[PDB]
Coordinates of all heavy atoms in Angstrom, one line a residue:
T64 N 0.8 -1.2 0.0 CA 0.0 0.0 0.0 C 0.8 1.3 0.0 O 0.3 2.3 -0.3 CB -0.9 0.0 1.2 OG1 -0.2 0.4 2.4 CG2 -1.6 -1.3 1.4
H65 N 2.1 1.2 0.3 CA 3.0 2.3 0.2 C 3.7 2.4 -1.1 O 4.3 3.5 -1.5 CB 4.1 2.3 1.4 CG 3.5 2.5 2.7 ND1 2.9 3.7 3.1 CD2 3.5 1.7 3.8 CE1 2.5 3.6 4.4 NE2 2.9 2.4 4.8
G66 N 3.7 1.3 -1.9 CA 4.4 1.3 -3.1 C 4.4 -0.1 -3.7 O 4.7 -1.1 -2.9
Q67 N 4.2 -0.3 -5.0 CA 4.1 -1.6 -5.6 C 4.3 -1.5 -7.1 O 4.0 -0.5 -7.7 CB 2.7 -2.2 -5.3 CG 2.6 -3.7 -5.7 CD 1.1 -4.1 -5.7 OE1 0.2 -3.4 -5.4 NE2 0.9 -5.3 -6.2
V68 N 4.9 -2.6 -7.6 CA 5.1 -2.6 -9.1 C 3.7 -2.5 -9.8 O 2.7 -3.2 -9.4 CB 5.8 -4.0 -9.4 CG1 5.8 -4.2 -11.0 CG2 7.2 -4.0 -8.9
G69 N 3.6 -1.7 -10.8 CA 2.4 -1.5 -11.5 C 1.5 -0.4 -11.0 O 0.4 -0.2 -11.5
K70 N 1.9 0.3 -10.0 CA 1.2 1.5 -9.5 C 2.2 2.6 -9.3 O 3.4 2.4 -9.2 CB 0.5 1.2 -8.1 CG -0.6 0.1 -8.3 CD -1.1 -0.3 -6.9 CE -2.1 -1.5 -7.0 NZ -3.1 -1.3 -8.1
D71 N 1.7 3.9 -9.3 CA 2.5 5.0 -9.1 C 2.7 5.2 -7.6 O 2.3 4.4 -6.7 CB 1.8 6.3 -9.7 CG 2.2 6.3 -11.2 OD1 3.4 6.1 -11.6 OD2 1.2 6.5 -12.0
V72 N 3.3 6.4 -7.2 CA 3.4 6.7 -5.8 C 2.8 8.1 -5.6 O 3.3 9.1 -6.2 CB 4.9 6.7 -5.3 CG1 4.9 7.1 -3.8 CG2 5.4 5.2 -5.4
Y73 N 1.8 8.2 -4.7 CA 1.2 9.5 -4.4 C 1.6 9.8 -2.9 O 1.2 9.0 -2.0 CB -0.3 9.4 -4.5 CG -0.8 8.7 -5.8 CD1 -0.9 7.3 -5.9 CD2 -1.0 9.4 -7.0 CE1 -1.3 6.7 -7.0 CE2 -1.4 8.8 -8.1 CZ -1.5 7.4 -8.2 OH -1.9 6.8 -9.3
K74 N 2.3 10.9 -2.7 CA 2.8 11.2 -1.4 C 1.9 12.3 -0.8 O 1.4 13.2 -1.5 CB 4.2 11.8 -1.5 CG 5.3 10.8 -1.5 CD 6.7 11.4 -1.7 CE 7.8 10.3 -1.5 NZ 7.8 9.8 -0.1
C75 N 1.6 12.1 0.5 CA 0.8 13.0 1.2 C 1.6 14.4 1.3 O 2.7 14.4 1.8 CB 0.5 12.5 2.6 SG -0.4 13.8 3.7
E76 N 0.9 15.4 0.8 CA 1.6 16.7 0.8 C 2.0 17.2 2.2 O 2.9 18.0 2.3 CB 0.8 17.8 0.1
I77 N 1.3 16.8 3.2 CA 1.5 17.2 4.6 C 2.5 16.4 5.3 O 3.5 16.9 5.8 CB 0.2 17.3 5.4 CG1 -0.8 18.4 4.8 CG2 0.4 17.5 6.8 CD1 -2.1 18.4 5.4
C78 N 2.3 15.1 5.4 CA 3.3 14.3 6.2 C 4.2 13.5 5.3 O 5.1 12.8 5.9 CB 2.5 13.3 7.1 SG 1.8 11.8 6.3
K79 N 4.1 13.5 4.0 CA 5.0 12.9 3.0 C 4.9 11.4 2.9 O 5.7 10.7 2.3 CB 6.5 13.2 3.3 CG 6.8 14.7 3.7 CD 6.5 15.7 2.5 CE 6.2 17.1 3.1 NZ 7.1 17.4 4.2
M80 N 3.8 10.8 3.6 CA 3.7 9.4 3.5 C 3.4 8.9 2.1 O 2.6 9.6 1.4 CB 2.6 8.9 4.4 CG 2.4 7.4 4.5 SD 1.1 7.0 5.7 CE 1.8 7.6 7.3
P81 N 4.0 7.9 1.6 CA 3.7 7.4 0.2 C 2.6 6.3 0.2 O 2.4 5.5 1.0 CB 5.1 6.7 -0.2 CG 5.6 6.2 1.1 CD 5.2 7.2 2.2
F82 N 1.8 6.4 -0.9 CA 0.7 5.5 -1.2 C 0.8 5.1 -2.6 O 1.1 5.8 -3.5 CB -0.7 6.2 -0.9 CG -0.9 6.6 0.5 CD1 -0.3 7.7 1.1 CD2 -1.6 5.7 1.3 CE1 -0.6 8.0 2.4 CE2 -1.8 6.0 2.7 CZ -1.3 7.2 3.2
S83 N 0.5 3.8 -2.8 CA 0.4 3.2 -4.2 C -1.0 3.4 -4.7 O -1.2 3.3 -6.0 CB 0.8 1.8 -4.2 OG -0.1 1.0 -3.4
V84 N -2.1 3.7 -3.9 CA -3.4 3.8 -4.4 C -3.9 5.2 -3.9 O -3.9 5.5 -2.8 CB -4.4 2.7 -3.9 CG1 -5.8 2.9 -4.4 CG2 -3.8 1.3 -4.3
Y85 N -4.4 6.0 -4.9 CA -4.8 7.4 -4.6 C -6.0 7.5 -3.7 O -6.0 8.4 -2.8 CB -5.0 8.1 -5.9 CG -5.3 9.6 -5.8 CD1 -4.2 10.5 -5.7 CD2 -6.6 10.1 -5.7 CE1 -4.4 11.8 -5.5 CE2 -6.8 11.4 -5.5 CZ -5.7 12.3 -5.5 OH -6.0 13.6 -5.3
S86 N -7.0 6.6 -3.8 CA -8.1 6.7 -2.9 C -7.7 6.4 -1.5 O -8.3 6.9 -0.6 CB -9.2 5.8 -3.4 OG -8.8 4.4 -3.4
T87 N -6.7 5.6 -1.3 CA -6.2 5.3 0.0 C -5.5 6.6 0.6 O -5.6 6.9 1.8 CB -5.2 4.2 0.0 OG1 -5.8 3.1 -0.7 CG2 -4.9 3.7 1.5
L88 N -4.8 7.3 -0.2 CA -4.2 8.6 0.2 C -5.4 9.6 0.6 O -5.2 10.4 1.5 CB -3.4 9.2 -0.9 CG -2.9 10.7 -0.7 CD1 -2.0 10.7 0.6 CD2 -2.1 11.2 -1.9
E89 N -6.5 9.5 -0.2 CA -7.6 10.4 0.2 C -8.2 10.0 1.5 O -8.5 10.9 2.4 CB -8.7 10.3 -0.9 CG -8.2 10.9 -2.3 CD -9.3 10.8 -3.3 OE1 -9.8 9.7 -3.6 OE2 -9.7 11.9 -3.8
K90 N -8.4 8.7 1.8 CA -8.8 8.3 3.1 C -7.8 8.8 4.2 O -8.2 9.2 5.3 CB -9.0 6.8 3.1 CG -10.1 6.3 2.2 CD -10.2 4.8 2.2 CE -11.3 4.4 1.2 NZ -11.3 2.9 1.0
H91 N -6.5 8.7 3.9 CA -5.5 9.2 4.8 C -5.7 10.6 5.1 O -5.6 11.1 6.3 CB -4.1 8.8 4.3 CG -3.0 9.6 5.0 ND1 -2.3 9.0 6.0 CD2 -2.5 10.8 4.8 CE1 -1.4 9.9 6.4 NE2 -1.5 11.0 5.7

C-alpha cells in the first residue's frame, strides 16, 4: 500500500507518506 510494481506513488503533501493507491491517500 506504500508502493508496488504497476502502481504510481502518491505522497501526502502534509506528512510525506507514500501511497500506491490514490483513494487510500484520500482516506488518509
Side-chain angles (χ1 to χ4, degrees), residues 64-75 77-91:
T64 77
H65 292 294
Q67 188 196 353
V68 171
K70 299 173 186 309
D71 279 314
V72 176
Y73 315 88
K74 274 175 174 295
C75 175
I77 293 175
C78 78
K79 319 295 155 42
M80 184 177 297
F82 293 82
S83 60
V84 181
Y85 184 85
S86 61
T87 312
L88 174 60
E89 295 181 302
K90 295 175 182 173
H91 164 97

